[PDB]
Ligand binder design. Structure first.
Ligand SMILES: Nc1ncnc2c1ncn2[C@@H]1O[C@H](COP(=O)(O)OP(=O)(O)OP(=O)(O)O)[C@@H](O)[C@H]1O
Ligand SMILES: Nc1ncnc2c1ncn2[C@@H]1O[C@H](COP(=O)(O)OP(=O)(O)OP(=O)(O)O)[C@@H](O)[C@H]1O
Ligand SMILES: Nc1ncnc2c1ncn2[C@@H]1O[C@H](COP(=O)(O)OP(=O)(O)OP(=O)(O)O)[C@@H](O)[C@H]1O
Ligand SMILES: [Mg+2]
Ligand SMILES: [Mg+2]
Ligand SMILES: [Mg+2]
Lengths: 523, 523, 523
C-alpha cells in the first residue's frame, strides 16, 4: 500500500512517544512496590500480571510510527525474556532511558552513530565490570533469597525453589505446573529431560506460553524414519482409540506428509505431537531405549524387526504428563516400572564403570544425572485461575532467576549493581566528543532501574540515587522497608546474567534506535 | 442559562486541571533560569513577559470548570501583585502546591475544612517565623542587591534604584517611564505625589496597566465644588482648545453629569481626567495651593472670588507628565517656576518653624518631604517596544521589591526563607489529625518555590531541596551559578513583605479551594 | 475568550514557523538580484514593492502562534524603517538568523537567558566595531553611489539625490512626490519645514503611508490659544467654502470639542488638519510670523487685536502643497510673495548680525538655513501608478540612505561590513558557556545578509561567504556583476547607521524570542 514517510524530529518524537507508551505501561511493574497490569484477552478472562514481557507483548498502538517504536522496544523485553526469563522490565526501563537521553543528545546536534558507538563501548566496559563485580551463588548460598526477590518478595516460593534445587541438584530439571490446592507443593517424580523442540510451530496449545502440554500422553519411540505412511496408519488408529495424546520421539519429523495430513484429519480434539531425539547414531538409540524403559515402551529398529504394524497399545510407553518446548522437551512423569527404572539405572552405572572413553564417559554421566535427578514438579496453588496464572508467572520468574544465579552468580539488587558499575566507568572515554556523550548517556541510563524502583515506592528517586551513589560496595536502598543498608546482607540479590543481559539488549536496541532519521510505514 | 453541576472528585479534578494549566503557564518564569512568556494581544504586537501576574491575567480556559479553577488561582497572583508588586509567580506556585497536596489529602479521606484550618494555623505560624527571621534592609544596606535580584539579575537596574533611593531618600517617590535611548537613565525632577485615585474607571488608558498617563497635561485646581456646568463650559472650551489634556484636582468629582457628558462629547482623542484632593478643609486648600504653585497655576475659592469664567489658560497650571493611579495620583514634572517653587519651600519651612501642633507639624514635614524629595524618574532604555515593555516591567518589579525591603526587611532568597521557616514549624500541631495533615501539607508546599527554581535550572529539585534543608541560617542554592552558599553574602535577597504576602494569599485561596464539593457553572 | 496555551518546543516551533514565513516573504527582496512582492490591496490595484517593511507589514498568518511570531518579527522591520528608513530586509534577515540559531542552541539544552545576554554583548561589541570601521561620507563623497545602491542600482536616482543635496546642502530638506512625466525631475522651491506632527491619528489620508497630504492647502496661523467655537466659526465657514483644504498651525490642538465636531461635520470630502508650532513664546511667534510671510498670511495675537472674526480668505496664507508627518510637518511650496520672502530673509539676516546670544544666534542660523535651503522636490516619473509607487518607494529609500550616510558615515555594502565586524569579534567571550554560544550565534547571524544576497543571485552562499571572510578590508562580492573586488571602490556603499540599526533591532527582538517557553493566545 501507499507509504507514509516521516523525517527527522517528527519521526523521532513519534517513535519516542511509542517507546514511552510501552515503557510506561511496563515500568509500573518494577520493584516490590510495583503494581500489576490487567491484559484483556479475547480468549477468556483478563490476565493480571507483574511480568514486563507480557505487558510488552500485549502493547500495540494505533499510530503507525508510535507502533513502530513500541514494537522495536518490545524486542528488548522479548530478547531479555528469551535469554534469561527475568529482568524484562529492567531491560525495558534501560532501553527507554538510553533512548530518551540519546534523543536529547541528538537534538543537541550530535552525531547519532558516534552516540551509538559510545553507548556500545560503555556497555561493553559495564559488562566487564559486572563480570568482575559478580559473586558466585555457590559461595553466597542464597538461592532462597534470589527466588524470593524474583517472586516479588515471596518467601515461600524462594524456600520451595531452594528445596527443589537441594533435592535434584543445582542443575537438575524443575517444572512449574498448575496445582490443585491453595498451597504450593513440591513433587520430585521420575522423568526425563532432553534439549529438543517441536518441528512444527502449529503444535502450540491454546495458551500463548509457546509450550504445548499433553494430559496423560502416550509415548512412541523409533530410531529409523520409515518411508511409507500406511505402515503406521494402524498405529494411529490404535492411537485414535487409546484415549491418550500421542507423542512421537524419533530422529526427525517432516510436515508435508505427516503434519499437514494430520492437521486436515481432525479439528484438534486430541493433540498429536512429534519431537526429535537427542544425539545421533548409537547415542540416539541409547537415549531412545532409556526413554522407552522409563515409560515402559519399546524402540523399533531394523535389527529387531519390531514393525509398527505389530505394535499394540500395551507395547508403547505412557507418561502422566509431558511438556514440549522449542528449547527443550521434557517428560514430567513417566510411569513405566520403578523396578525397570532402577535396573536400567544400575545397568547404565555399570556401563559407566566399564567405559573409559572421555566422550562416552561424559555422556554416560549425563544420562545417569538425568535419571537420578528426575523431574521436580512445583504445584502452583491458588484459589482462582487468575491467581493461578499470576503466582505461576512469579514462580517461573523465580526459577529462571535461580538458574541464572547458579550459572553466573549474583550482584546487589535494586539497581545497585548498575549504579556501582556506572561509577567505575566515569573515567571511560571514546574517540571523539559525541562518543563521550554517548558513554555518558549510557552511564546515566544505568541509574534508571534504581530511580524507577524508588519512584514506584513514592520516594524521591534523585535523593535515593544520590545516597546510593555516595555509598560503596553493596550499599543500597531497600525498597520493601524504606531504609538503606547492604543489599546482599538484606537478601536482595540479583543474578549477574539477568542484569548483564538486560543491559546488553537494551543497549543494542536503543543505540540502534537513536540513529534513525526516517521511518516508512503504511497510511 | 442552564447550569452544569459537578460533584466530588470530578469537580475537584476539573478544578485542579484548570489550576495546573494556569500555574504551569506561570511557573516557567520563576527564578533566574525562568523563561519569558508570550501573550497574544488583540491590539498590537504580542507582549513578552517574565512577570507572573501578566501571564495569570491572560489565562482563560475553554472548559468552564477548569476556567473556574484558573480564575480562582489567578486571584492569588492578582492579590499578591496588588499588595506587594512582586512574588506573583511564587504565590501562584505556593497556591498550586497547597491545592495539589490538599487534594491528595482529601482523596485520602481527610476532612477538607479541618485541612484548611490546619493550613491557616501553619501559615500564621510561618508568618510569625518570617517576621522573627526578617533582617532590616537598613542594617544590611543591600538595596542594589534586592533590585538586581528582582530585575532578573540585572546589576544596572539595582544600581539605578539604589542611586534613586539615595537621591530622593528611602521613602521618596520614584516613577518608571519609557525612555528614548538604549540606556537606562535616571532623572530627579520636581513633582508632587499624593494618595488619590481617579473617580471613574472609564479613564483607563489604552494599555491595561490600570493607570492612565497624560502627555503634557494641564492642571486645574479648585477647593469649592460649583454647581452649574455652564460656569466651566467656557473653561472646558478653552481647555478643549488649549491642546494639553486636562487634569482636574478638586475635593470630589461625579460622573453622571461630568463623565457621561464628556463621554458623549469626546470619542477619546484627548483624555480628560479628574482626581480627588488629599486632606480636607484647610489642609486640602494648602495642598491645592502647593500644587498650583508647583505647576504655576492658581486655586479658585469663594473667599477670593476667582471665578472660573474669568480663568484663562495662562492662569491655570501645566505639567510635563502626570500619571494617575487608583492608589495614588502623582505629578511627574510640573514646570511652574523654579524660583516660585523654592520660595514656597522656604515659606513652608518657615511655617514648620512657627508651627508647634503635632498634627500640623507632621503634615508640614510631609509637605516639605514631598517638595524636597522631588520626583525620581527612571527612563527605561530599549531598542524596541517589546524590550521596552519587558525591561519596564523588570524595573517596576525592582522598585516594588526595594520598597518592600525598606518597609519590612529582607530574607534569604531563592525559596530558602520558606524552607527555613518550614523546619522551625516541624513541631506544630493542630486540634485533630486532619488539622495536622493540613499543617504538613502547608509545610511541604512551602518548599515549592525552591523546587520550582531548581527545576527551571534543569537540576534535580529533590536533591537541592534536601541539601538546602540540611543546612542552616542563610545557606542555600545559587540558581544563577549552580552552587551552594550563604544566600545573603551571595547577594540574593527577598523582601520579607513579598514572601509573607505570597504565602498568606496563596494559603487563603488554596485552602478555600480544597474545601469545595460542588461546582455550578453554565453549559 | 478562551485561551490556547502552548509550552516548550511546540510553541517554539510554531513561533519559528511564523518567523520563517514572514522572513521568507521578505528575504526575496534583498540585494540587486532580489525580486518584487505583490501585495493585495482591498483599496485598489495591487502594490508591487521591493521594500522590506511593506512586505512585513502586509504579512499576517492564520495560525495564532505563527501569527504571533510573524508580528514580533514584523516589529523588527517596523523599528528599522522608523529609525533609518532603510535596511528593513537586512534587519529581518538578521533577526531570522538569530532566531534560528538561538532555537538550535536552545534545543541543545542551553539556557536561553544566557544566550540572550551573549547575543546582546556580541551586538554591543559589533556596534562599537562598526563605529570604528565607519568612514565619513564627507571624506568619501559618494552620495550618488549611496543613493544608487539604495535605489536598487538606479544611477539616475543617485545622481538626482546628489544634485539635490548639492543645491540645498547636505542637511537641507528634500521631499519625494509623485511626478507627471515619465522622467524623474528635481525642483528646488520655497517652503518651510518644522519638527511637529498631527495631534490626532484620524487625520491620516487614504494611503497607509501615515502622512497626510493636502492638495493646494490653506494656511492658518495663531500664537495665542482661542477659547470658543463661535468666534472662529465664521472663519471655518469661509474656509469651508473657499475651496482649499485648511492647515492649522498653532501651539497645540485638542480633539474633544474640535476634532470630534469636525469629524461629525463631514464624511471625508475635504480634510481639515491642525499641527503644533515648534518653540515657545517669542520663538513660536517668530516662526509663526515667518511662515505667515512665506505664505502671505497673517498672525493673530492679543497685542495686535487682529481678531479671526475679521479675518478674510485673502488675509490668510496659502500653499501649493503641504505634507504632514508625526515626526516632522513640512510646507512644500508656499507662494506668498517672492519679494516678501527675500525681504524677510534680509531682515532675519540683519537680526543675526545684531544678535549676540548663543541660543538666539543659533536659532537665527536655523531659521536662515530653513529659508535659504528651501524645499527640494523630486518628481517621480513613471508611465503607470504601480511603477509610480515602486519608483517613489525606491527614491524614498535612497533619500533615507543618503541622509544616514551624511549623518553617520558609510561602510562596505553587500553584508561585507557585518562579515568584517564579525571576524574582529571572534575573540569575544562571555561569563559562561551559554553566553559564549550566544555570542557565536550572533557572530554567525552576521553572515546572513551576505549569504541571502548571494542566494538571491543563484550563486552558492557558503563559497562566497568563505571567500569574503578570507579577504580583508572592504573586499567583497559584487552581486550585480558576479565578481569580487573592493566594495567601496566598486561603489557599493551602505550607511553605518542603517547597518547598526538593523543589527541592534534584530538583536533585541530575536534575543527576546529565544527565551520564550510558554505562549498564550485565543482559540
Ligand atoms: N525488596 C526489594 N528492594 C529493592 N529492590 C528490590 C526488591 N525486590 C526486588 N528488587 C529489585 O527490583 C527488580 C525486580 O523487579 P521485577 O522482577 O518486577 O522486574 P525485572 O527483574 O525487570 O523483570 P520482570 O518484571 O520481567 O520480572 C530487580 O532489579 C531487583 O533487584
Ligand atoms: N540568582 C538567584 N539564585 C537563586 N534564587 C534566585 C536568584 N534570583 C532570584 N531568585 C529567587 O527567585 C524568585 C524571583 O523569581 P521571579 O522574579 O521570576 O518571581 P517572583 O519574585 O515570585 O515574581 P514575579 O515573576 O511576579 O516577578 C525569588 O524567590 C528569588 O529569591
Ligand atoms: N550591487 C550590489 N552588490 C552587492 N550588494 C549590494 C548591491 N546593491 C545593494 N547591495 C546590498 O544589498 C542590501 C540592500 O538591499 P535592499 O535595498 O533590497 O534591502 P533593504 O534596504 O534591507 O530592504 P527594504 O527596502 O525592504 O527596507 C545592502 O546590504 C546593500 O549593501
Ligand atoms: Mg523481574
Ligand atoms: Mg519578581
Ligand atoms: Mg534599501
Amino acid at each position: 500500500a501507499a507509504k507514509d514517510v516521516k523525517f527527522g524530529n517528527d519521526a523521532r518524537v513519534k517513535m519516542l512517544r511509542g517507546v514511552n507508551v510501552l515503557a510506561d505501561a511496563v515500568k509500573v511493574t518494577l520493584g516490590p512496590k510495583g503494581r500489576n497490569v490487567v491484559l484483556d484477552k479475547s480468549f477468556g478472562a483478563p490476565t493480571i500480571t507483574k511480568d514486563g514481557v507480557s505487558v510488552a507483548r500485549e502493547i500495540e498502538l494505533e499510530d503507525k510510527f508510535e507502533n513502530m517504536g513500541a514494537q522495536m522496544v518490545k524486542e528488548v523485553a522479548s530478547k531479555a525474556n528469551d535469554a534469561a526469563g527475568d529482568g524484562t522490565t529492567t531491560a525495558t526501563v534501560l532501553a527507554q532511558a538510553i533512548i530518551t537521553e540519546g534523543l536529547k543528545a541528538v537534538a543537541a546536534g550530535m552525531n547519532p552513530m558516534d552516540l551509538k558507538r559510545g553507548i556500545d563501548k560503555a556497555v561493553t566496559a559495564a559488562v566487564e565490570e559486572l563480570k568482575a563485580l559478580s559473586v558466585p551463588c555457590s559461595d553466597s548460598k542464597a538461592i532462597a533469597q534470589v527466588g524470593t526477590i524474583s517472586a516479588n518478595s515471596d518467601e515461600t516460593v524462594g524456600k520451595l525453589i531452594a528445596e527443589a534445587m537441594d533435592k535434584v541438584g543445582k542443575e537438575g530439571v524443575i517444572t512449574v505446573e498448575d496445582g490443585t490446592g491453595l498451597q504450593d507443593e513440591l513433587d520430585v517424580v521420575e522423568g526425563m529431560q532432553f534439549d529438543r523442540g517441536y518441528l512444527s510451530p502449529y503444535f502450540i496449545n491454546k495458551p500463548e506460553t509457546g509450550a504445548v502440554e499433553l494430559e496423560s500422553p502416550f509415548i512412541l519411540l523409533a530410531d529409523k524414519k520409515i518411508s511409507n505412511i500406511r505402515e503406521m496408519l494402524p498405529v494411529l488408529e490404535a492411537v485414535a482409540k487409546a484415549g491418550k495424546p500421542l507423542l512421537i520421539i524419533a530422529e526427525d519429523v517432516e510436515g508435508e506428509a505427516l503434519a499437514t495430513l494430520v492437521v486436515n484429519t481432525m479439528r484438534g480434539i486430541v493433540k498429536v505431537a512429534a519431537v526429535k531425539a537427542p544425539g545421533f547414531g548409537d547415542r540416539r538409540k541409547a537415549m531412545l531405549q532409556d526413554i522407552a524403559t522409563l515409560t515402559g515402551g519399546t524402540v523399533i529398529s531394523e535389527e529387531i524387526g519390531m514393525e509398527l504394524e505389530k505394535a499394540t497399545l500395551e507395547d508403547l510407553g505412557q507418561a502422566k504428563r509431558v511438556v514440549i518446548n522449542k528449547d527443550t522437551t521434557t517428560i514430567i512423569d513417566g510411569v513405566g516400572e520403578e523396578a525397570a527404572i532402577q535396573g536400567r539405572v544400575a545397568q547404565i552405572r555399570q556401563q559407566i564403570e566399564e567405559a573409559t572413553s572421555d566422550y562416552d564417559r561424559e555422556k554416560l554421566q549425563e544420562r545417569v544425572a538425568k535419571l537420578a535427578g528426575g523431574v521436580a514438579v512445583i504445584k502452583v496453588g491458588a484459589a482462582t485461575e487468575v491467581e493461578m496464572k499470576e503466582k505461576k508467572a512469579r514462580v517461573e520468574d523465580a526459577l529462571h532467576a535461580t538458574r541464572a544465579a547458579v550459572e553466573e552468580g549474583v550482584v546487589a539488587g535494586g539497581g545497585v549493581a548498575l549504579i556501582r558499575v556506572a561509577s567505575k566507568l566515569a573515567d571511560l572515554r571514546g574517540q571523539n566528543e559525541d562518543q563521550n556523550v554517548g558513554i555518558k548517556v549510557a552511564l546515566r541510563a544505568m541509574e534508571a532501574p534504581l530511580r524507577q524502583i524508588v519512584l514506584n515506592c513514592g520516594e524521591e528517586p534523585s535523593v535515593v540515587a544520590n545516597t546510593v551513589k555516595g555509598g560503596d560496595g553493596n550499599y543500597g536502598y531497600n525498597a520493601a522497608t524504606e531504609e538503606y543498608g547492604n543489599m546482599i546482607d538484606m537478601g536482595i540479590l540479583d543474578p549477574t546474567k539477568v542484569t548483564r543481559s538486560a543491559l546488553q539488549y537494551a543497549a543494542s536496541v536503543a543505540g540502534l534506535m537513536i540513529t534513525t532519521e526516517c521511518m516508512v510505514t503504511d497510511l
